[PDB]
């Protein structure tokens, strides 16, 4: 897999974001994770987390997996990085997302995220408290 550039257009919530990619505005849905909706417990915390991580970064990148690049709603499916640090993994590590929606052929970073979740659960963080 390889990283590609993008720039923030606007934060949305824990697992979606509006980015410009190849010069076009797109809503991205982060691969392999599920954050609570804003309406839910830890929703606002997830959204604040990704809003901060992505607004403070100098360099946003997206990395597509080997499978579908867009979902049925036209959302881009990617791993997002903020100054080299994967937002999808950071959410999981902090107990602000569950590993979820693991489809075959778009699951390159599955084990990486599961290891993060195991550590979040150990530490009883947020969703796991």
Q: Which residues are catalytic?
A: 29, 37, 75
Contact 69, 84 (CB under 8 A): no
In the complex, the smallest distance separating the C-beta of residue 58 from ligand THP, rounded to whole angstroms, is 27
Q: Taking CB under 6 A as the rule, does residue 40 contact ligand THP?
A: no
Contact 111, 80 (CB under 8 A): no
In the complex, the smallest distance separating the C-beta of residue 88 from ligand THP, rounded to whole angstroms, is 10
User: Is 83 one of the annotated binding-site residues?
Assistant: no
Contact 36, 84 (CB under 8 A): no
Among 17, 19, 29, 42, binds ligand THP (CB under 6 A): 29
Cβ-count burial of 1 within 10 angstroms (0-12 exposed, 13-18 middle, 19+ buried)? exposed
User: Is 65 one of the annotated binding-site residues?
Assistant: no
Q: Taking CB under 6 A as the rule, does residue 77 contact ligand THP?
A: yes
Give the CA angle between residues 116, 7, 30 to the nearest 5°. Answer: 35
Which part of the chain contacts ligand THP (CB under 6 A), choosing from 2-10, 43-51, 101-109, 114-122? 101-109
In the complex, the smallest distance separating the C-beta of residue 30 from ligand THP, rounded to whole angstroms, is 7
User: Considering beta carbons, is residue 101 or 114 the nearer one to ligand THP?
Assistant: 101
DSSP 37: P
Question: What is the rounded distance in angstroms from the CA atom of residue 120 to the CA atom of residue 94?
Answer: 6
Per CB under 6 A, residues contacting ligand THP are: 15, 29, 31, 34, 71-72, 77, 101, 103, 106
């Amino acid at each position: 897999l390889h990283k590609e550039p993008a720039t923030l257009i606007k934060a949305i919530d824990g697992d979606t974001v509006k980015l410009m990619y190849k010069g076009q505005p797109m809503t991205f849905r982060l691969l392999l994770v599920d954050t609570p909706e804003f309406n839910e417990k830890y929703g606002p915390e997830a959204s604040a987390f990704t809003k901060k991580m992505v607004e403070n970064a100098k360099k946003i990148e997206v990395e597509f997996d080997k499978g579908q690049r867009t979902d049925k709603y036209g959302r881009g499916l990617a791993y997002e990085y903020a100054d080299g640090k994967m937002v999808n993994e950071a959410l999981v590590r902090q107990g602000l997302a569950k590993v979820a929606y693991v489809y075959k052929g778009n699951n390159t970073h599955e084990q990486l995220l599961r290891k993060a979740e195991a550590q979040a659960k150990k530490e009883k963080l947020n969703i796991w408290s």
